[PDB]
Amino acid sequence: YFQSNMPILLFLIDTSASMNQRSHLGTTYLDTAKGAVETFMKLRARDPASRGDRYMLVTFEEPPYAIKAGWKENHATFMNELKNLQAEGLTTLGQSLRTAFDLLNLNRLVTGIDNYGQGRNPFFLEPAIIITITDGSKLTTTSGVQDELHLPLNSPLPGSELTKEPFRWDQRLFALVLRLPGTMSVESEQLTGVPLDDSAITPMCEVTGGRSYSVCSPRMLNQCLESLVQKVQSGVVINFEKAGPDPSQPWHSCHKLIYVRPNVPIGHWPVPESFWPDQNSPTLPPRTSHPVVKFSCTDCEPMVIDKLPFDKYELEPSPLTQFILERKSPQTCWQVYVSNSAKYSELGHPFGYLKASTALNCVNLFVMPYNYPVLLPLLDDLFKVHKAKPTLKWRQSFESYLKTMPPYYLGPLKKAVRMMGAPNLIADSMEYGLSYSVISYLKKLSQQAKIESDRVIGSVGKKVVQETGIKVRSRGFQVALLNKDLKPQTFRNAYDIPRRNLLDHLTRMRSNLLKSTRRFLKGQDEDQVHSVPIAQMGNYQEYLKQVPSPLRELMMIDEAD
């Protein structure tokens, strides 16, 4: 249904002119960044799961030219665009980050992965990470210097208002801040952890669930690239919060990631919305990109019935996981809430729990139906007391539970009870979460997103010509500049022939014209041919195909076997 087995690796390479600073290596910061991307892919390729990785490239240029490799751009195009990056612009970090997130969220509304107004599905994920490689240089615009990072809001994407942040559930921002000095640093190659950077990108990185890396040595660079390769995971960032008193600490608030394991991820129960749905609301309330999940450190019992579909999501290592595995209570669980998901309750009813594993090696989130301590006894009694033949009191209690039960859970609950073996338990009716106006707005957004996606995907080719001109001041007319595409057809155009080369080249074109008897009438030799791109210079495998085949008879590389 959704392919989470094809992770997106968006690279936001800083192409501001400050990336022309030279390290002690003799290479620029941009050269270090390109080498870092290449090393990252070399390290990633060791993992067999690396196949199907989508690699994307966005830069600090303007939106028509910011996207170098987006959707439906093959690996060779990515490599060619990476190799030819030039650092010649301003440090428009906020604008470029906005464009990168818009590129990531380009097709979300077309495919309905966000599941707006219908619960948040951790298995509806398109896992991407933005690895932005930059320096700590201050952010710049034409007007002046920006001391802080602020993503622009102008030109909003259709439906961008539905989530109150640009980044999404399944997106993480990582910053590789290059602080490599121009002098060979006297510090030893200490094996300590990588520091968090103090630039303006670090708050945005931490908010997204990622982190910033400060680099000032090639050894540190390798360490960050290895850690980044380890951080390419399919999962969604959950904003875990603490509710109630202790049983201002690192484990009180955390933007941790929960793992989602495919095989096509399979799941049933959504994360509750942050509002109670109604059929008379003209507009859908905006969503936080990371759901505020509240847990109570009470150590309740993790009740489970035999045949229920329960989604299990393994939390990544975090101080909260450290706390849970340090208290050492694998037989108890902390109830988990979403605030304002209920009709009236501010904290709302539980929908799941954190239960440490048997080995105390990991903590897993068990996503249950909404208000599961009330539903699960009833659901057990349905099949244990009367064998899916509901009684009057049971049906009344079930309906009473349904009053506290949000309509967006109706579909998953129907599917669950059907696969237990009681298909006729509830009325087969459409979910009452969304008004007609809301659904019409959603379909209009889907069409607009389709059109905008078509426009953006076709725009990544940079099929435009740079303004090769010098605007002449009075105290219209412009002075042209050399271009890449004006390859001199000196045989076909007499204006491309320099004066110093006029006579010999005249002889050459004369011979090319008259001596073509039983020969070849090509353009200028030594230009159209023998100025091949270096990549195709020694492509003997491709060259041998154009030659007739012969007769059969029976440290890394040096241009052949």
């Binding site: 249904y1 009325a427 087969d428 009716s429 459409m430 979910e431």
Partner: peptide
């Protein structure tokens, strides 16, 4: 709402006699 159960679910919802249930499964299909 599975890829191999999208048509089956929307057809069972159509046969159930609900004029609104089909529209919900149509989006998933």
């Amino acid at each position: 709402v599975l890829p191999t159960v999208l048509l089956d679910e929307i057809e069972a919802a159509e046969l159930e006699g609900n004029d609104d249930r089909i529209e919900g499964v149509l989006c998933g299909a």
